[PDB]
Amino acid sequence: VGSLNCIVAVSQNMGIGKNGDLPWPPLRNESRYFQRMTTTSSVEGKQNLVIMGKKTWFSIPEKNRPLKGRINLVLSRELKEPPQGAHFLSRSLDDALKLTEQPELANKVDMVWIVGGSSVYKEAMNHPGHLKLFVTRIMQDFESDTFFPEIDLEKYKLLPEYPGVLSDVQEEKGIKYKFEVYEKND
């Protein structure tokens, strides 16, 4: 309906997950920022849609499932029905976007947030149209078993600044990271 965005935390070796979880120790402020970006809606009486693969759903601690104040959609071709706590189930990303245009959700949804995993990001990244990437750069190498797709800099531009995103290097548990905003339109 509105804006389509991807949001991801990545290590310096482009790693995003190791055994069902994050490769680095928990960053409470990095988690808070994911929460704030995905939950805030720009319009009244409207909520954001969160779209994720099934192994991403199963890595959110059970006590936080479904993500509060968000419409939670799970992607999977194997599942018969949405997992317990999930609001919707889709077989592909074109179908999940064909769904926000149903009067059911059409008047309800402001932004669309892709929250992973690899397979999901890869396809959003090739979708034609306006898209923004929200990338947290975790500045060290971490042994990973799942990786973020290559960002094609001939198509995506790094923005010099973005409203409500801090520009400086953060530090938490001795780890440095920074926030980037990339924009495409083709």
Ligand SMILES: NC(=O)C1=CN([C@@H]2O[C@H](COP(=O)(O)OP(=O)(O)OC[C@H]3O[C@@H](n4cnc5c(N)ncnc54)[C@H](OP(=O)(O)O)[C@@H]3O)[C@@H](O)[C@H]2O)C=CC1
């Ligand atoms: N650092 C960060 O930002 C992030 C880290 N993570 C972490 O990364 C890993 C999650 O990994 P990843 O394996 O890539 O998993 P996904 O969450 O992408 O799960 C893959 C499953 O999702 C379904 N699916 C994925 N893409 C599609 C599609 N286009 N259409 C329909 N179904 C699809 C399929 O389920 P089926 O097999 O049922 O058809 C596929 O087997 C974890 O280790 C997690 O903690 C996750 C997201 C962000």
Ligand SMILES: CN(Cc1coc2nc(N)nc(N)c12)c1ccc(C(=O)N[C@@H](CCC(=O)O)C(=O)O)cc1
């Ligand atoms: C593995 N993922 C993907 C994930 C984690 O960190 C990220 N950080 C970024 N920048 N992008 C993402 N996609 C992720 C997640 C795992 C658990 C929760 C979760 O518990 N979220 C609570 C967090 C609340 C909190 O930390 O208090 C929420 O309300 O959003 C979210 C995402």
